Homo-oligomer: 89 residues x 3
Amino acid sequence: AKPANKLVIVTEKILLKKIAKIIDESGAKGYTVMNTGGKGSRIEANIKFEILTETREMAEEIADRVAVKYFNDYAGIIYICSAEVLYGH
Amino acid sequence: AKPANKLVIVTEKILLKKIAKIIDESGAKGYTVMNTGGKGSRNVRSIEANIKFEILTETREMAEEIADRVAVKYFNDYAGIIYICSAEVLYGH
Amino acid sequence: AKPANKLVIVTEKILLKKIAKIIDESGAKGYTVMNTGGKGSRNVRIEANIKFEILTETREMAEEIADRVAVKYFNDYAGIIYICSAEVLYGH
Ligand SMILES: Nc1ncnc2c1ncn2[C@@H]1O[C@H](COP(=O)(O)OP(=O)(O)O)[C@@H](O)[C@H]1O
Ligand SMILES: Nc1ncnc2c1ncn2[C@@H]1O[C@H](COP(=O)(O)OP(=O)(O)O)[C@@H](O)[C@H]1O
Ligand SMILES: Nc1ncnc2c1ncn2[C@@H]1O[C@H](COP(=O)(O)OP(=O)(O)O)[C@@H](O)[C@H]1O
């Protein structure tokens, strides 16, 4: 097993490509994304990204870049969970 | 960051509005939901047939309140599971 | 509450039934599965994927599922497997 951070970003669907680019530019080795619905504080259609990162710093870089650039104008939440990677490429 | 409980409810898709109502009434500030498939006990019920809710709560007690209400109201008649994970909130409205 | 391991497998959609069989054979009482997209190493393929979530009684059960899936399929198919802590509150 390898300890890891799992970064979750739930945000508006229109940001899909812009957030993917941020994720890639961070050095993250991959991400999972899915359509979801929800309600918060622009059911509404949303997207959820899950990104298992190398380090906490990598997760924080993604989170900061997304939130700073987009969260004043777009709905979203960002949170992190602990995960242990068992198998991967 | 702020520590939080992430409450997960996986249940029948037809309960979407009924569980949302309980979440809203609990004081929780939001939820995420998605369509899923799955198998469990495989007892007769009265993507595919399920929904999965994710609710980041204020407190553990709020999470438990949602869970307790859902289970008492619906889990005798409907499929489902409820669990909680730890999360840290980084950014939010 | 009952402590538990939540095993996550994200892999190719074609493997749905095959992985469900492994999960069932492990003694796991259930699983959740959903359609997702993603990208990774691009070793053998955004692509459409499936994500399983399996709450197991024990760590050993989680590991048995993970080991069987990875050995059987992950040389030849895309995927990742990871585990999170969970506490089960209610269930059938
Ligand atoms: N407390 C929460 N628990 C889980 N998901 C949440 C929570 N708060 C917000 N969300 C998710 O983030 C999305 C965006 O929330 P927010 O930015 O507050 O705006 P909105 O109410 O416009 O959806 C929600 O639709 C939901 O999917
Ligand atoms: N151990 C488990 N791990 C992950 N998901 C589970 C587990 N048990 C049940 N689930 C999820 O909860 C849903 C409801 O399970 P249950 O109430 O046992 O009845 P059913 O067999 O009709 O689906 C399952 O379809 C699955 O999505
Ligand atoms: N670091 C990561 N964070 C989240 N999801 C990941 C990560 N790396 C891989 N994944 C998920 O696993 C799937 C399979 O990954 P991989 O085997 O590297 O192949 P592919 O690049 O063909 O998708 C990815 O599509 C993605 O959904």
